[PDB]
């Protein structure tokens, strides 16, 4: 069973969102700023959703997205140089990953595994390091321009879903 047409609001303490279809997930505007030292977020079985997290409520840790199709993924990762974003079994997703960092040559590593036809926004090219760990020692991803719709979650919903 999946849940349809629900807006999920990320709050501190939440760590998992699963079995979503034509849903949205966004960061809460309330209790903002307060963060835990370490955390982890996991998304699993996501279809035709908009994930738009402009605020993460842990300083260090990871975001995992697994089994995700035809979705929009906007993430604003913490400044933590070692922050992890691991993407597995993504198909036909548009991705905007930015890092909230005052660092000069700020880079966000993105680990991908078994992804296909993923589009990373071209604006993020110089800031991401994509490492394909599918079969560790081409059409997995590409960098293209697309309208980010002012990062308005429902506009993205209407534009791409």
Numbering used by the authors: 101 to 237, 245 to 268
Sentences from the paper on this structure:
activating protein (GAP) function of TBCC. homology domain (light green), and a β-sheet domain (dark green). interaction with TBCC (as determined by mass spectrometry). from each other, without dissociation from the TBC-DEG/TBCC platform. αβ-tubulin configuration and activate Arl2 GTP hydrolysis.
